[PDB]
């Protein structure tokens, strides 16, 4: 069941006195005329922000509550009990029966304490303090929620520190409200007690009473608030995509190159896809170093370079920053601060031939290591030692570029592998290659949140009739506010009217005549009120 509070769950926000002073407060209250659960006789409830809790009987079936996050061990909780003797507050780590009505553990106790009817309680928990307000009124019924006003006086204060997310009850009819941040107007007696209140977010009369800070409004017309239409979503127009950026001249070429003279190709204005390259599931090595393979589809770049060649199978590990060997010492050196991805796959069915395919040579001898990302095609003699040969042969002279032998009748690791190395850089180029992106079409005649290639704003968009000279990006208004734009994609001018906004006034005949009310939304078109 569910029931309706009427004016219930008002507590003194603090100490301090007061005489006849309509005191306005902002705090956590139980809103007037709320939807309070009903329980008969129970289960684990939430807490989430304070709790109102009433109860009715002449016997004592309600024997305290239990609080916490897990209501067990492994985390701490509170326990508030009352046998026929008196109250027993307690804070340990417990083991609670899932249907408790005694416990089963009392470890690590960090706080102890020992020593019909309507009994209301307000529980809240702020800054490690667990506050409890309470009130005991006598009903002239037995167990139904009555009507009336009765303010709740503070009882306890516990500097625990405990976290709370759940609570229960203990039994040998009760309700559960929740508290939200509201603003109230409390009427104080001359002895200093709260006798009446106003919830200032109920209807127009209450909002007027709150605006005036009074309980009696005289006839008139009062500005009470404002309306403002709300904007949803946010378009993001952009000039025609651009390109598709093919790499068929990278991967799908008719032949790769040899590793002593590796080819290279840069990338310009493009839309470069990267997920569709990865998921083909035929790649021997796909190793991304400075980037994750799942973020490409979204990060713009400033320059992309592709290297491509053929090397054997037992040297694909050499294409990595900080290796050693005839492919990385002086054929292809990678710099240590690399950020691209090495892709490589076996090509024993293209670059292989019985009898041999000797197009693919490689340097096997060099004076020393060759820094990163340069090459050498200085095909000369090689010199061995203290002899002057200098271009003879035979007596330990050489030509330092040996061909490969690639037949299909050769074991793996000695087979041709095609290698494509991607390298990126990002310094300050304001518009370069980005992956497959997506925003959303444009809309009109609705207060919207828009972005037109940099112009960020809010408002209603409408078809224009202002001839934007073929060269005018937008429209400027005296006092300098953007009032027209041009769509990059379709190149049409659109006006940007502002989103409705306006005061709200309340018309009342006076509370001494009636409590009906009328409402004026000032210079707002009456079709966009709610």
């Amino acid at each position, epitope marked *: 069941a569910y029931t309706n509070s009427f004016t219930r769950g008002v507590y003194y926000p603090d100490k301090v006195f007061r005489s006849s002073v309509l005191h306005s407060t902002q705090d956590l209250f139980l809103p007037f005329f709320s939807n309070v659960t009903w329980f008969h006789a129970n289960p684990v409830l939430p807490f989430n922000d304070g709790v109102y809790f009433a109860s009715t009987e002449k016997s004592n079936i309600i024997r305290g509550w239990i609080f916490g996050t897990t209501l067990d061990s492994k985390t701490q909780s509170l326990l508030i009990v009352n046998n026929a003797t008196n109250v027993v507050i307690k804070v340990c780590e417990f083991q609670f029966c899932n249907d408790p009505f005694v416990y089963s553990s009392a470890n690590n106790c960090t706080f102890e304490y020992v020593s019909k009817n309507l009994r209301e309680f307000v529980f809240k928990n702020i800054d490690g303090y667990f506050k409890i307000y309470s009130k005991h009124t006598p009903i002239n019924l037995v167990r139904d929620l009555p009507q009336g006003f009765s303010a709740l006086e503070p009882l306890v204060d516990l500097p625990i520190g405990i976290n709370i997310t759940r609570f229960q009850t203990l039994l040998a009819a009760y309700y559960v409200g929740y508290l939200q941040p509201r603003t109230f107007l409390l009427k104080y007696n001359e002895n200093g007690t709260i006798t009446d209140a106003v919830d200032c977010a109920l209807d127009p009369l209450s909002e007027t009473k709150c605006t005036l800070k009074s309980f009696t409004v005289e006839k008139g017309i009062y500005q009470t608030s404002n309306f403002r239409v709300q904007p949803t979503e946010s378009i993001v127009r952009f000039p025609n995509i651009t390109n598709l950026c093919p790499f068929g001249e990278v991967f799908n070429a008719t032949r790769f190159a040899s590793v002593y003279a590796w080819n290279r190709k840069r990338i310009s204005n493009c839309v470069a896809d990267y997920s569709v390259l990865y998921n083909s599931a*035929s790649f021997s090595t796909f190793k991304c170093y400075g980037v994750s393979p799942t973020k490409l589809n979204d990060l713009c770049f400033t320059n992309v370079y592709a290297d491509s060649f053929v090397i054997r199978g037992d040297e694909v590990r050499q294409i990595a920053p900080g290796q050693t060997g005839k492919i990385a010492d002086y054929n292809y050196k990678l710099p240590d601060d690399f950020t691209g991805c090495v892709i490589a*796959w076996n090509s024993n*069915n*293209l670059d292989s031939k*019985v009898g041999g395919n000797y197009n693919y040579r490689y340097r096997l001898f060099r004076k020393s290591n060759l820094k990163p990302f340069e090459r050498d095609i200085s095909t000369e003699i090689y010199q061995a030692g203290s002899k002057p040969c200098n271009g003879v042969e035979g007596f330990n002279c050489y030509f330092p570029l040996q061909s490969y032998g690639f037949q*299909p*009748t050769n*074991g793996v*690791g000695y087979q041709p592998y*095609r290698v494509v190395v991607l390298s990126f850089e990002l310094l300050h180029a304001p518009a370069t290659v980005c992956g497959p992106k997506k925003s959303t079409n444009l809309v009109k005649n609705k207060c919207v949140n828009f972005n037109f290639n940099g112009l960020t704003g809010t408002g209603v968009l409408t078809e224009s009739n202002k001839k934007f000279l073929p060269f005018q990006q937008f429209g400027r208004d005296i006092a300098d506010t953007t009032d027209a734009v041009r769509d990059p994609q379709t190149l049409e001018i659109l006006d940007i009217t502002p989103c409705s906004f306006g005061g709200v006034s309340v018309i009342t005949p006076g509370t001494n005549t009636s409590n009906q009310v009328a409402v004026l939304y000032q210079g707002v078109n009456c079709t966009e009120v709610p």
Partner: antibody
Amino acid sequence: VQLVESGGGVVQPGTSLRLSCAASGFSFSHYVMYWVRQAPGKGLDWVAIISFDGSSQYYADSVKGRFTISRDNSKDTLYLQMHSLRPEDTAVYYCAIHGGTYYYDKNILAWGQGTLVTVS
Amino acid sequence: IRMTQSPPTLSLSPGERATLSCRASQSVTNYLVWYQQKPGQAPRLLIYDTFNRATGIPARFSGSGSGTDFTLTISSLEPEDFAVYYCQQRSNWPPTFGQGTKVDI
């Protein structure tokens, strides 16, 4: 994928026989094919390979010089051309696919269902 | 590069599990395929590349092993799955099939 082979029968020791293998389904080019014999009452053993156009053919033992395998993707079949035979390679023959040429070739394998050749 | 299957014929009932081993003369990685040849049928393939079986082959067939030693396992096949088995490599040219292992009861 499908593979249909033809050219079986009874011959004499020193004739010839057209061993043809027809393929459909998957694209017959971009794909490496080969043959495999089995003498009835033995295991399995291969014959000859062809590499997606005739540039490189490898052969097995004791079949080099009597066997000219050729493919032709402009009519999408495969041939062994058994020629001047022996009375000891009476067997069953299967054309199968080695697989893959490019990176986008999605290697799948498939076999025929046999072609029986017998001698006198 | 010659394959071999060293366990000979076995007599495992319709139940229990069977484990069949295939070697290689040198290093072959993720390149083997298993065939199950009945008496007088076409050799039906089992397992793509040491780990995933093809379509129409149930889950009780599993294929694993690495380095140079590979293994096919029958968890609890059924009351028929008795034939000869072959391991083949697709590393280089050409694909050698090995020897073969029968199973009886």
